[PDB]
Amino acid sequence: KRELNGYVFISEDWRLPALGSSAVPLTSDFLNIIYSIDKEELPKAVELGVDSRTKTVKIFASVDKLLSRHLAVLGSTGYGKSNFNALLTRKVSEKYPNSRIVIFDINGEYAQAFTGIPNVKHTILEKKQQKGELYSEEYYCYKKIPYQALGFAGLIKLLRPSDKTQLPALRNALSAINRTHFKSRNIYLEKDDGETFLLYDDCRDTNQSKLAEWLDLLRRRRLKRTNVWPPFKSLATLVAEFGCVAADRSNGSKRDAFGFSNVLPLVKIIQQLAEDIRFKSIVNLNGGGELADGGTHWDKAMSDEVDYFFGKEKGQENDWNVHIVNMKNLAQDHAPMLLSALLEMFAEILFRRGQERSYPTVLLLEEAHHYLRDPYAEIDSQIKAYERLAKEGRKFKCSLIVSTQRPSELSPTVLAMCSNWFSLRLTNERDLQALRYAMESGNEQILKQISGLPRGDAVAFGSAFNLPVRISI
Amino acid sequence: ETFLLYDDCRDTNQSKLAEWLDLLRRRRLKRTNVWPPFKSLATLVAEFGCSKRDAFGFSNVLPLVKIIQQLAEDIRFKSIVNLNGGGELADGGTHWDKAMSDEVDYFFGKEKGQENDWNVHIVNMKNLAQDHAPMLLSALLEMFAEILFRRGQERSYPTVLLLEEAHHYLRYERLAKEGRKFKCSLIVSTQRPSELSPTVLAMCSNWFSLRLTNERDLQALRYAMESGNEQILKQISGLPRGDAVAFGSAFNLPVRISINQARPGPKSSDAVFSEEW
């Protein structure tokens, strides 16, 4: 209808046309009027593309409500999905140079087209340029992660003890890591008064009538602290030591073969995992760190790495705006177990940070089905972690962008939290059926159209768009 | 005389534990007056699961002790529920009864015939994680039902209960079937009616349906409707904002009305990522 100011469109379907009325099609001006957006969204809008039917009208979307909730992109990789993601990220970056975006890459394609943007870094798993300088190739730094961040629960999960009394032995061993004195091959210390404490390396029966009280005073925690982080082999020796000793009734010792028989799988798996090339190249197992007093050392060993990957809080200056994490030298076996461990820690840090200080964040995880779902197990531990991360993501300032190619393999609960959908061509039936089951703002016509979309054509529907439309880009 | 207990299957003082457990089961020991810490269950299970503590029967109870010790040091879980104890214990066998009754009386009001203070209660749970809401909320509802049964018909008081976003934890069902008998009412709010059990939608007598779009959700509504026709279900697929269709025992004929605005409204706080950039 025409008002004193201009043309306004109203969404209601309770009025019907009169009998005998003539019908005419619509021109470019009417499409412009219909597909427009409110005036208050003009400063917050971004160009996205043009419709594939008429190629005459430009369609804009409010960033605030597009990224306030979660977002998901579905399609086939290599047919324009990567181009769409790169274009969306690049267009987001240009409007606000002071925006923070983190990208978890799988193959080295997303870093190629991001050149010419201030505050761009790289990571593969030296020379640093000044602030404001653009980005070119051959400016890639190197880094890796040590095992101090995995934590008590992380080591428990990786070792997966599932027999006998292995669990209590591991708990006792891991409770005595801050008080392990290590040298080239000698683990011993003299006392302050003058008494000398010694340990042996041979696995033989020697003066074990006092080894029980040695471990007793170790558990009592009245022994000297340490200032260097012990190497990875320390836990193997510690777990081997426990369970082979016993307390005799009077002046004796016992070498129980059953205890060593029960313990041997742990040392076997530890030594098998220690010797590796595809794994040993990511985990810094050497140790040689620095400790802290007070007994609270676990928190910082994770906080520092969370800060390194994702940045600092408000009020503390940061130098990077876009941080692509390019990973290629990771075997397909260890990806779901290592990558999924990087998100629970981020969720915990987000909880600890609180509402008082927080910074807007955009995350662009790619190939979700590779690490969100373990392909050689049925345990849904990753499901709980992901859903807790998503739940905390809306309470605080965070937003995810899921990007997969085989929607059937994804858990059906994953698509529940998303609010907007971008879809490409799909050449299967199971993926379409999965899409229809767990979607919102549906329409049968677009669902039929998406079966035979050509190259470069995508559909969009959600809370941001008032009327679903197909765009070309 | 005192005897100690450990966890790591220690081969220490394995001579007289059998008579200790025999006397414990025979109920001839001394009773305490303080609540033990929650972590003691791990040691109790370790002791009861094995004149020598064999390691073959211990393997049969590994998952239970593992889970109970895993939940012990989880920071999120212990921020909502107490795990320290230290309370008064009465004399007899009614110690659980008061422990449930006092908390239930605190939460869901007091018994009729006694003075009360509040008339409207708002329970705010934003710090509770989504991985733990079902268990705690279902436990609270079960406690409420169990306390309701033994209070009696003549001692009950009317109560209206609102349950927002109810499909997570209503998915045991004593409340929905005894609410009428024990003078209690429920209001259900859910944006996905399919997840709700098919037997809970039948007891409702009035319906206030806003706009729905998914095809599966609308089919579940047709299955359990009892006071409506197919002529009005077509309007739901295109209802504008603020409009609703109502039908039930309180309406002579189905109607399509536009709801008013409440002043003051609720806190619709929404995060803005453009002002801070």
Side-chain angles (χ1 to χ4, degrees), chain B residues 243-274:
Chain B
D243 284 287
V245 296
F247 54 80
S249 68
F251 293 73
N252 212 332
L253 60 84
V255 72
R256 180 205 195 164
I257 60 171
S258 72
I259 311 166
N260 278 329
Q261 190 157 3
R263 285 181 224 109
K267 183 63 59 184
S268 66
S269 67
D270 292 332
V272 175
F273 289 166
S274 283

PDB file of all heavy atoms in Angstrom, chain B residues 243-274:
ATOM      1  N   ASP B 243      -0.929 -13.138  16.960  1.00  0.00           N
ATOM      2  CA  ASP B 243      -2.236 -13.758  16.804  1.00  0.00           C
ATOM      3  C   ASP B 243      -2.199 -15.213  17.256  1.00  0.00           C
ATOM      4  O   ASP B 243      -1.169 -15.887  17.187  1.00  0.00           O
ATOM      5  CB  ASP B 243      -2.707 -13.677  15.350  1.00  0.00           C
ATOM      6  CG  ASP B 243      -3.188 -12.292  14.970  1.00  0.00           C
ATOM      7  OD1 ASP B 243      -4.288 -11.904  15.414  1.00  0.00           O
ATOM      8  OD2 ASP B 243      -2.468 -11.591  14.231  1.00  0.00           O
ATOM      9  N   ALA B 244      -3.353 -15.698  17.712  1.00  0.00           N
ATOM     10  CA  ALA B 244      -3.461 -17.063  18.199  1.00  0.00           C
ATOM     11  C   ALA B 244      -4.875 -17.575  17.969  1.00  0.00           C
ATOM     12  O   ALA B 244      -5.821 -16.798  17.806  1.00  0.00           O
ATOM     13  CB  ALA B 244      -3.095 -17.161  19.684  1.00  0.00           C
ATOM     14  N   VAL B 245      -5.008 -18.900  17.961  1.00  0.00           N
ATOM     15  CA  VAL B 245      -6.294 -19.577  17.839  1.00  0.00           C
ATOM     16  C   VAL B 245      -6.528 -20.386  19.108  1.00  0.00           C
ATOM     17  O   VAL B 245      -5.613 -21.054  19.603  1.00  0.00           O
ATOM     18  CB  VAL B 245      -6.357 -20.467  16.583  1.00  0.00           C
ATOM     19  CG1 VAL B 245      -6.258 -19.615  15.337  1.00  0.00           C
ATOM     20  CG2 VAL B 245      -5.243 -21.493  16.589  1.00  0.00           C
ATOM     21  N   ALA B 246      -7.739 -20.297  19.649  1.00  0.00           N
ATOM     22  CA  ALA B 246      -8.061 -20.912  20.926  1.00  0.00           C
ATOM     23  C   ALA B 246      -9.296 -21.789  20.793  1.00  0.00           C
ATOM     24  O   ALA B 246     -10.238 -21.462  20.067  1.00  0.00           O
ATOM     25  CB  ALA B 246      -8.296 -19.858  22.015  1.00  0.00           C
ATOM     26  N   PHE B 247      -9.280 -22.911  21.509  1.00  0.00           N
ATOM     27  CA  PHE B 247     -10.420 -23.813  21.562  1.00  0.00           C
ATOM     28  C   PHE B 247     -10.300 -24.669  22.812  1.00  0.00           C
ATOM     29  O   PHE B 247      -9.196 -24.926  23.299  1.00  0.00           O
ATOM     30  CB  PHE B 247     -10.511 -24.687  20.303  1.00  0.00           C
ATOM     31  CG  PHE B 247      -9.250 -25.445  19.987  1.00  0.00           C
ATOM     32  CD1 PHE B 247      -8.944 -26.622  20.647  1.00  0.00           C
ATOM     33  CD2 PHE B 247      -8.375 -24.982  19.022  1.00  0.00           C
ATOM     34  CE1 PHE B 247      -7.791 -27.317  20.355  1.00  0.00           C
ATOM     35  CE2 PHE B 247      -7.219 -25.673  18.726  1.00  0.00           C
ATOM     36  CZ  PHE B 247      -6.926 -26.842  19.393  1.00  0.00           C
ATOM     37  N   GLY B 248     -11.442 -25.106  23.325  1.00  0.00           N
ATOM     38  CA  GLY B 248     -11.449 -25.937  24.513  1.00  0.00           C
ATOM     39  C   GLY B 248     -12.795 -25.865  25.210  1.00  0.00           C
ATOM     40  O   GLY B 248     -13.802 -25.505  24.606  1.00  0.00           O
ATOM     41  N   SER B 249     -12.778 -26.220  26.494  1.00  0.00           N
ATOM     42  CA  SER B 249     -13.992 -26.248  27.298  1.00  0.00           C
ATOM     43  C   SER B 249     -14.452 -24.866  27.738  1.00  0.00           C
ATOM     44  O   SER B 249     -15.609 -24.721  28.147  1.00  0.00           O
ATOM     45  CB  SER B 249     -13.785 -27.130  28.530  1.00  0.00           C
ATOM     46  OG  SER B 249     -12.856 -26.544  29.423  1.00  0.00           O
ATOM     47  N   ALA B 250     -13.587 -23.857  27.671  1.00  0.00           N
ATOM     48  CA  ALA B 250     -13.919 -22.514  28.126  1.00  0.00           C
ATOM     49  C   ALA B 250     -14.395 -21.600  27.006  1.00  0.00           C
ATOM     50  O   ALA B 250     -14.701 -20.433  27.268  1.00  0.00           O
ATOM     51  CB  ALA B 250     -12.714 -21.882  28.828  1.00  0.00           C
ATOM     52  N   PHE B 251     -14.467 -22.091  25.772  1.00  0.00           N
ATOM     53  CA  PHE B 251     -14.868 -21.283  24.629  1.00  0.00           C
ATOM     54  C   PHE B 251     -16.054 -21.939  23.941  1.00  0.00           C
ATOM     55  O   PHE B 251     -16.021 -23.140  23.651  1.00  0.00           O
ATOM     56  CB  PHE B 251     -13.712 -21.108  23.640  1.00  0.00           C
ATOM     57  CG  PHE B 251     -12.567 -20.296  24.180  1.00  0.00           C
ATOM     58  CD1 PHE B 251     -11.717 -20.820  25.140  1.00  0.00           C
ATOM     59  CD2 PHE B 251     -12.345 -19.007  23.733  1.00  0.00           C
ATOM     60  CE1 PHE B 251     -10.668 -20.076  25.637  1.00  0.00           C
ATOM     61  CE2 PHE B 251     -11.296 -18.260  24.228  1.00  0.00           C
ATOM     62  CZ  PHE B 251     -10.457 -18.795  25.181  1.00  0.00           C
ATOM     63  N   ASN B 252     -17.100 -21.150  23.686  1.00  0.00           N
ATOM     64  CA  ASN B 252     -18.286 -21.682  23.024  1.00  0.00           C
ATOM     65  C   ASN B 252     -17.984 -22.142  21.606  1.00  0.00           C
ATOM     66  O   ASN B 252     -18.455 -23.206  21.188  1.00  0.00           O
ATOM     67  CB  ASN B 252     -19.397 -20.634  23.016  1.00  0.00           C
ATOM     68  CG  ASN B 252     -20.776 -21.250  23.093  1.00  0.00           C
ATOM     69  OD1 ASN B 252     -20.989 -22.381  22.659  1.00  0.00           O
ATOM     70  ND2 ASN B 252     -21.725 -20.508  23.652  1.00  0.00           N
ATOM     71  N   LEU B 253     -17.213 -21.364  20.853  1.00  0.00           N
ATOM     72  CA  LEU B 253     -16.811 -21.740  19.505  1.00  0.00           C
ATOM     73  C   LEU B 253     -15.368 -21.313  19.290  1.00  0.00           C
ATOM     74  O   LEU B 253     -14.921 -20.332  19.897  1.00  0.00           O
ATOM     75  CB  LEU B 253     -17.742 -21.116  18.452  1.00  0.00           C
ATOM     76  CG  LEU B 253     -17.898 -19.597  18.328  1.00  0.00           C
ATOM     77  CD1 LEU B 253     -16.809 -18.960  17.477  1.00  0.00           C
ATOM     78  CD2 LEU B 253     -19.272 -19.257  17.775  1.00  0.00           C
ATOM     79  N   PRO B 254     -14.614 -22.032  18.459  1.00  0.00           N
ATOM     80  CA  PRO B 254     -13.209 -21.670  18.236  1.00  0.00           C
ATOM     81  C   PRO B 254     -13.076 -20.264  17.669  1.00  0.00           C
ATOM     82  O   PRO B 254     -13.837 -19.855  16.791  1.00  0.00           O
ATOM     83  CB  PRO B 254     -12.725 -22.727  17.239  1.00  0.00           C
ATOM     84  CG  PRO B 254     -13.643 -23.882  17.444  1.00  0.00           C
ATOM     85  CD  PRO B 254     -14.973 -23.293  17.789  1.00  0.00           C
ATOM     86  N   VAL B 255     -12.083 -19.530  18.167  1.00  0.00           N
ATOM     87  CA  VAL B 255     -11.927 -18.117  17.852  1.00  0.00           C
ATOM     88  C   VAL B 255     -10.465 -17.827  17.536  1.00  0.00           C
ATOM     89  O   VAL B 255      -9.559 -18.539  17.981  1.00  0.00           O
ATOM     90  CB  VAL B 255     -12.430 -17.227  19.013  1.00  0.00           C
ATOM     91  CG1 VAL B 255     -11.469 -17.283  20.189  1.00  0.00           C
ATOM     92  CG2 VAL B 255     -12.652 -15.790  18.551  1.00  0.00           C
ATOM     93  N   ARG B 256     -10.244 -16.778  16.746  1.00  0.00           N
ATOM     94  CA  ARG B 256      -8.915 -16.296  16.385  1.00  0.00           C
ATOM     95  C   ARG B 256      -8.762 -14.883  16.934  1.00  0.00           C
ATOM     96  O   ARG B 256      -9.371 -13.943  16.414  1.00  0.00           O
ATOM     97  CB  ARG B 256      -8.719 -16.323  14.871  1.00  0.00           C
ATOM     98  CG  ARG B 256      -7.359 -15.843  14.400  1.00  0.00           C
ATOM     99  CD  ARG B 256      -7.437 -15.332  12.973  1.00  0.00           C
ATOM    100  NE  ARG B 256      -6.121 -15.199  12.361  1.00  0.00           N
ATOM    101  CZ  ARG B 256      -5.916 -15.077  11.057  1.00  0.00           C
ATOM    102  NH1 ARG B 256      -6.920 -15.072  10.197  1.00  0.00           N
ATOM    103  NH2 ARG B 256      -4.671 -14.956  10.604  1.00  0.00           N
ATOM    104  N   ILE B 257      -7.951 -14.731  17.980  1.00  0.00           N
ATOM    105  CA  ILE B 257      -7.827 -13.467  18.690  1.00  0.00           C
ATOM    106  C   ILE B 257      -6.378 -12.998  18.652  1.00  0.00           C
ATOM    107  O   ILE B 257      -5.445 -13.781  18.460  1.00  0.00           O
ATOM    108  CB  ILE B 257      -8.317 -13.573  20.147  1.00  0.00           C
ATOM    109  CG1 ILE B 257      -7.494 -14.609  20.910  1.00  0.00           C
ATOM    110  CG2 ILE B 257      -9.794 -13.927  20.186  1.00  0.00           C
ATOM    111  CD1 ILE B 257      -7.764 -14.635  22.394  1.00  0.00           C
ATOM    112  N   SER B 258      -6.203 -11.693  18.844  1.00  0.00           N
ATOM    113  CA  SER B 258      -4.891 -11.065  18.929  1.00  0.00           C
ATOM    114  C   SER B 258      -4.641 -10.654  20.374  1.00  0.00           C
ATOM    115  O   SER B 258      -5.368  -9.816  20.918  1.00  0.00           O
ATOM    116  CB  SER B 258      -4.802  -9.858  17.997  1.00  0.00           C
ATOM    117  OG  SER B 258      -5.579  -8.781  18.489  1.00  0.00           O
ATOM    118  N   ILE B 259      -3.617 -11.240  20.987  1.00  0.00           N
ATOM    119  CA  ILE B 259      -3.350 -11.048  22.408  1.00  0.00           C
ATOM    120  C   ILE B 259      -2.816  -9.642  22.651  1.00  0.00           C
ATOM    121  O   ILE B 259      -2.144  -9.049  21.800  1.00  0.00           O
ATOM    122  CB  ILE B 259      -2.372 -12.128  22.912  1.00  0.00           C
ATOM    123  CG1 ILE B 259      -2.838 -13.511  22.458  1.00  0.00           C
ATOM    124  CG2 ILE B 259      -2.266 -12.100  24.423  1.00  0.00           C
ATOM    125  CD1 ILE B 259      -1.794 -14.592  22.614  1.00  0.00           C
ATOM    126  N   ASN B 260      -3.126  -9.098  23.827  1.00  0.00           N
ATOM    127  CA  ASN B 260      -2.706  -7.756  24.204  1.00  0.00           C
ATOM    128  C   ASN B 260      -1.217  -7.745  24.550  1.00  0.00           C
ATOM    129  O   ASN B 260      -0.508  -8.745  24.407  1.00  0.00           O
ATOM    130  CB  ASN B 260      -3.554  -7.245  25.366  1.00  0.00           C
ATOM    131  CG  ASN B 260      -4.888  -6.687  24.916  1.00  0.00           C
ATOM    132  OD1 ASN B 260      -5.010  -6.157  23.813  1.00  0.00           O
ATOM    133  ND2 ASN B 260      -5.896  -6.800  25.773  1.00  0.00           N
ATOM    134  N   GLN B 261      -0.728  -6.598  25.013  1.00  0.00           N
ATOM    135  CA  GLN B 261       0.658  -6.424  25.420  1.00  0.00           C
ATOM    136  C   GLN B 261       0.721  -6.192  26.924  1.00  0.00           C
ATOM    137  O   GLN B 261      -0.066  -5.416  27.474  1.00  0.00           O
ATOM    138  CB  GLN B 261       1.306  -5.249  24.683  1.00  0.00           C
ATOM    139  CG  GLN B 261       2.806  -5.145  24.878  1.00  0.00           C
ATOM    140  CD  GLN B 261       3.482  -4.373  23.764  1.00  0.00           C
ATOM    141  OE1 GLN B 261       2.822  -3.859  22.862  1.00  0.00           O
ATOM    142  NE2 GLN B 261       4.804  -4.290  23.821  1.00  0.00           N
ATOM    143  N   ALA B 262       1.659  -6.865  27.583  1.00  0.00           N
ATOM    144  CA  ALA B 262       1.819  -6.749  29.026  1.00  0.00           C
ATOM    145  C   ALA B 262       2.827  -5.655  29.355  1.00  0.00           C
ATOM    146  O   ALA B 262       3.959  -5.675  28.861  1.00  0.00           O
ATOM    147  CB  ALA B 262       2.268  -8.080  29.629  1.00  0.00           C
ATOM    148  N   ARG B 263       2.412  -4.706  30.187  1.00  0.00           N
ATOM    149  CA  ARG B 263       3.276  -3.616  30.634  1.00  0.00           C
ATOM    150  C   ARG B 263       3.408  -3.677  32.149  1.00  0.00           C
ATOM    151  O   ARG B 263       2.385  -3.572  32.859  1.00  0.00           O
ATOM    152  CB  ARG B 263       2.734  -2.257  30.199  1.00  0.00           C
ATOM    153  CG  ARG B 263       2.925  -1.942  28.726  1.00  0.00           C
ATOM    154  CD  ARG B 263       2.380  -0.561  28.399  1.00  0.00           C
ATOM    155  NE  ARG B 263       1.603  -0.545  27.165  1.00  0.00           N
ATOM    156  CZ  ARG B 263       0.287  -0.395  27.115  1.00  0.00           C
ATOM    157  NH1 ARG B 263      -0.434  -0.246  28.214  1.00  0.00           N
ATOM    158  NH2 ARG B 263      -0.321  -0.393  25.932  1.00  0.00           N
ATOM    159  N   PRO B 264       4.621  -3.838  32.690  1.00  0.00           N
ATOM    160  CA  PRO B 264       5.899  -3.987  31.984  1.00  0.00           C
ATOM    161  C   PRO B 264       6.102  -5.399  31.448  1.00  0.00           C
ATOM    162  O   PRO B 264       5.624  -6.367  32.032  1.00  0.00           O
ATOM    163  CB  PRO B 264       6.922  -3.629  33.067  1.00  0.00           C
ATOM    164  CG  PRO B 264       6.278  -4.111  34.333  1.00  0.00           C
ATOM    165  CD  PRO B 264       4.803  -3.841  34.153  1.00  0.00           C
ATOM    166  N   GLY B 265       6.812  -5.543  30.335  1.00  0.00           N
ATOM    167  CA  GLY B 265       7.061  -6.842  29.757  1.00  0.00           C
ATOM    168  C   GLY B 265       8.268  -7.516  30.374  1.00  0.00           C
ATOM    169  O   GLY B 265       8.824  -7.056  31.376  1.00  0.00           O
ATOM    170  N   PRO B 266       8.697  -8.625  29.783  1.00  0.00           N
ATOM    171  CA  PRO B 266       9.865  -9.338  30.301  1.00  0.00           C
ATOM    172  C   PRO B 266      11.159  -8.764  29.738  1.00  0.00           C
ATOM    173  O   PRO B 266      11.168  -7.932  28.831  1.00  0.00           O
ATOM    174  CB  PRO B 266       9.638 -10.777  29.826  1.00  0.00           C
ATOM    175  CG  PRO B 266       8.735 -10.658  28.624  1.00  0.00           C
ATOM    176  CD  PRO B 266       8.126  -9.280  28.596  1.00  0.00           C
ATOM    177  N   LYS B 267      12.272  -9.234  30.307  1.00  0.00           N
ATOM    178  CA  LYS B 267      13.605  -8.772  29.923  1.00  0.00           C
ATOM    179  C   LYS B 267      14.072  -9.559  28.702  1.00  0.00           C
ATOM    180  O   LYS B 267      14.652 -10.643  28.798  1.00  0.00           O
ATOM    181  CB  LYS B 267      14.580  -8.910  31.085  1.00  0.00           C
ATOM    182  CG  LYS B 267      15.975  -8.388  30.787  1.00  0.00           C
ATOM    183  CD  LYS B 267      15.959  -6.895  30.504  1.00  0.00           C
ATOM    184  CE  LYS B 267      15.399  -6.116  31.682  1.00  0.00           C
ATOM    185  NZ  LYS B 267      15.289  -4.661  31.384  1.00  0.00           N
ATOM    186  N   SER B 268      13.812  -8.992  27.526  1.00  0.00           N
ATOM    187  CA  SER B 268      14.235  -9.615  26.279  1.00  0.00           C
ATOM    188  C   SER B 268      15.658  -9.202  25.928  1.00  0.00           C
ATOM    189  O   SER B 268      15.895  -8.623  24.863  1.00  0.00           O
ATOM    190  CB  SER B 268      13.282  -9.242  25.142  1.00  0.00           C
ATOM    191  OG  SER B 268      13.358  -7.858  24.845  1.00  0.00           O
ATOM    192  N   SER B 269      16.609  -9.490  26.813  1.00  0.00           N
ATOM    193  CA  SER B 269      17.992  -9.102  26.570  1.00  0.00           C
ATOM    194  C   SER B 269      18.582  -9.939  25.442  1.00  0.00           C
ATOM    195  O   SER B 269      18.538 -11.173  25.479  1.00  0.00           O
ATOM    196  CB  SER B 269      18.822  -9.268  27.842  1.00  0.00           C
ATOM    197  OG  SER B 269      18.947 -10.634  28.194  1.00  0.00           O
ATOM    198  N   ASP B 270      19.134  -9.261  24.440  1.00  0.00           N
ATOM    199  CA  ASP B 270      19.744  -9.910  23.289  1.00  0.00           C
ATOM    200  C   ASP B 270      21.133  -9.335  23.067  1.00  0.00           C
ATOM    201  O   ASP B 270      21.317  -8.114  23.074  1.00  0.00           O
ATOM    202  CB  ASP B 270      18.886  -9.732  22.031  1.00  0.00           C
ATOM    203  CG  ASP B 270      17.571 -10.486  22.111  1.00  0.00           C
ATOM    204  OD1 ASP B 270      17.517 -11.514  22.818  1.00  0.00           O
ATOM    205  OD2 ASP B 270      16.593 -10.051  21.468  1.00  0.00           O
ATOM    206  N   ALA B 271      22.108 -10.221  22.877  1.00  0.00           N
ATOM    207  CA  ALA B 271      23.486  -9.790  22.692  1.00  0.00           C
ATOM    208  C   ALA B 271      23.635  -9.033  21.379  1.00  0.00           C
ATOM    209  O   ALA B 271      23.084  -9.435  20.349  1.00  0.00           O
ATOM    210  CB  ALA B 271      24.426 -10.994  22.720  1.00  0.00           C
ATOM    211  N   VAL B 272      24.382  -7.932  21.418  1.00  0.00           N
ATOM    212  CA  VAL B 272      24.651  -7.114  20.241  1.00  0.00           C
ATOM    213  C   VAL B 272      26.136  -7.197  19.926  1.00  0.00           C
ATOM    214  O   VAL B 272      26.978  -6.871  20.772  1.00  0.00           O
ATOM    215  CB  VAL B 272      24.216  -5.657  20.461  1.00  0.00           C
ATOM    216  CG1 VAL B 272      24.621  -4.801  19.271  1.00  0.00           C
ATOM    217  CG2 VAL B 272      22.715  -5.583  20.691  1.00  0.00           C
ATOM    218  N   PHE B 273      26.461  -7.640  18.713  1.00  0.00           N
ATOM    219  CA  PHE B 273      27.846  -7.755  18.283  1.00  0.00           C
ATOM    220  C   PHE B 273      28.294  -6.601  17.397  1.00  0.00           C
ATOM    221  O   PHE B 273      29.454  -6.583  16.967  1.00  0.00           O
ATOM    222  CB  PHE B 273      28.061  -9.077  17.538  1.00  0.00           C
ATOM    223  CG  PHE B 273      28.009 -10.286  18.424  1.00  0.00           C
ATOM    224  CD1 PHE B 273      27.899 -11.553  17.882  1.00  0.00           C
ATOM    225  CD2 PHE B 273      28.080 -10.154  19.800  1.00  0.00           C
ATOM    226  CE1 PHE B 273      27.855 -12.666  18.697  1.00  0.00           C
ATOM    227  CE2 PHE B 273      28.032 -11.262  20.617  1.00  0.00           C
ATOM    228  CZ  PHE B 273      27.922 -12.519  20.066  1.00  0.00           C
ATOM    229  N   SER B 274      27.415  -5.637  17.120  1.00  0.00           N
ATOM    230  CA  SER B 274      27.758  -4.502  16.278  1.00  0.00           C
ATOM    231  C   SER B 274      28.126  -3.250  17.056  1.00  0.00           C
ATOM    232  O   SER B 274      28.934  -2.456  16.566  1.00  0.00           O
ATOM    233  CB  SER B 274      26.597  -4.173  15.328  1.00  0.00           C
ATOM    234  OG  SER B 274      26.548  -5.092  14.250  1.00  0.00           O
TER     235      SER B 274
END
